[model samples]
Target: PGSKPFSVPVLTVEEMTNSRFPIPLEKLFTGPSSAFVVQPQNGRCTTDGVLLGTTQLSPVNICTFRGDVTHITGSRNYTMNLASQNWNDYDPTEEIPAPLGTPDFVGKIQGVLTQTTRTDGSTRGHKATVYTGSADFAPKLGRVQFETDTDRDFEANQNTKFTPVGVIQDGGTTHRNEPQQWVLPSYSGRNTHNVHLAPAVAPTFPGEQLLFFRSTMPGCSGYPNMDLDCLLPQEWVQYFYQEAAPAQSDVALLRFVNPDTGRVLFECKLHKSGYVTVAHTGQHDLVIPPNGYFRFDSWVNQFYTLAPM
Candidate 1:
């Protein structure tokens, strides 16, 4: 997890002045601010519907290492220096093929990582380039649009960074799994683990804004010692919704306008867990430390809708 990061300056949105707690959580999240932003949109949410569908976490099966540890490409390209290390403790999921099967088509890679580790407990240090598989991302989401990654990528021009904090569905309640959802990022046996497999910003386009970074999983934050436990906490997903940089293992949204439909949509980062935000400013430092500590600089997911017409 020790890798030099390449990040861009954050562009802060103008601060909102209203400090009032409008929609009380006790009243179905209907705060007073609903009159100003929510009432209008609830009406048409179902109007142009094409029978929207969603996916529930498949009942957990023990067939795989982790049923929820799904990803499209678990690669993080960054600067890692192994002055002296021994151990197969690379970033989680980096060794295995993406859960959805990474098909080598199109004759070119869609993306690349910031850092990479070999299956053997060795690292590339500072010169590593891991290609990305664009097609396999959303297919492996397992759920509707929730994607979980295990690394962060901070390379040039690559656009699959940032993490989400929370997610909400239309009809389902219980996520129906032992731990529901999670995003874990760490190497178990060695310090030579390559790290940081994520882009620095949410993947979006002009006129294409999304409710980015909404995860239904727990994150890797409470583990005490990897040497004793032989593993980092396994399930967590952080999303990017703020102006600050994304902390490790956090999620971000990938939104773009449809060329044909003109609709804005998103895809989950199947695997890879860099771009998760950690402490940036003084306000984020916690008195307590985690197995790892992270400080983020921004909050990205905004679910406010137009008033119910």
Candidate 2:
């Protein structure tokens, strides 16, 4: 996942503070702040009203892959060259179609690895060395989207990069189909697979305005009552959101505004680990370290009213 990144220079505090969207700091910290909404007048979220409280997002079936591996395209454009002296792997989901389907696509790393074997059992020049490569990224995910980049207009615009880590042990003493750690950026796989966010900043409008990164789904995999083949054309819609930049810091709301309707279906303080306001900075790290939170890729299938709890 070594890729050079093209990024806009982050606006300093004064820059964001100057754009000065109308929302008040008190409301931002204590109540719903002014932000973008994706709905229109007389929409389901407005007239009929919506929230994840009732039979909506409660019965959720959550499926996710590593959302951080996408940092390759996070900034602008340019794939990184980490110096491929060893095995080089590539994900071809771009040319090939993702297996599981939309929102959740399938991907794999095709690489060349060297293997050594001793034919004479002497472990000398008689040993044979072979190079092997595989093209496999099975167990595809539901093609889903919580947010898309509305900030940049490079080639990799949509949020469709799929990277899930796993370790499989076949017929081992203690092993199962296990999801392991990330293996890129070296630092993460090195110290502990600590990598940065795709763009280091959440995808949002200029001035670090909060945006909705929400999506809808039919059902999920973990729950028993849920349908694996969950089908609901309406519920399958995807809405991507972006949190206020760290520079925006306090008094900012992670609002899912209806860019179309100009209404906020719901709002909550932005945080990490999939829950709201659960971090020290009250927001997820701009650049998540290796083994950081993967729940940023998790989505709920309901429309719940976000209120002060």
Best by TM-score: 2
TM-score of 1: 0.17
lDDT of each: 0.19, 0.20
- State residue 86's C-alpha deviation in candidate 2, in Å: 18
How do the residues 208-309 of candidate 1 rate in per-residue lDDT, one tens digit apiece? Answer: 211211211212223211110100011111011112232233333222223345443222221123211221211211222112122222223423221121
lDDT for each residue of candidate 2 in 1-309, tens digit (9 for 90 to 100) = 232221112222112110011111111111121331211100011111121100122111112222211223453222211211112332323221221121111112111111122343221111111100111122122112212222232122122222211112222323322111111122112233212211121313222222222211111112111101111111211111122122222222343333345554344443221123211222221321212111121122223223422
- Candidate 2: residue 171 lDDT (0-100): 26
C-alpha root-mean-square deviation, candidate 2: 21.6
TM-score, one value per model: 0.17, 0.20
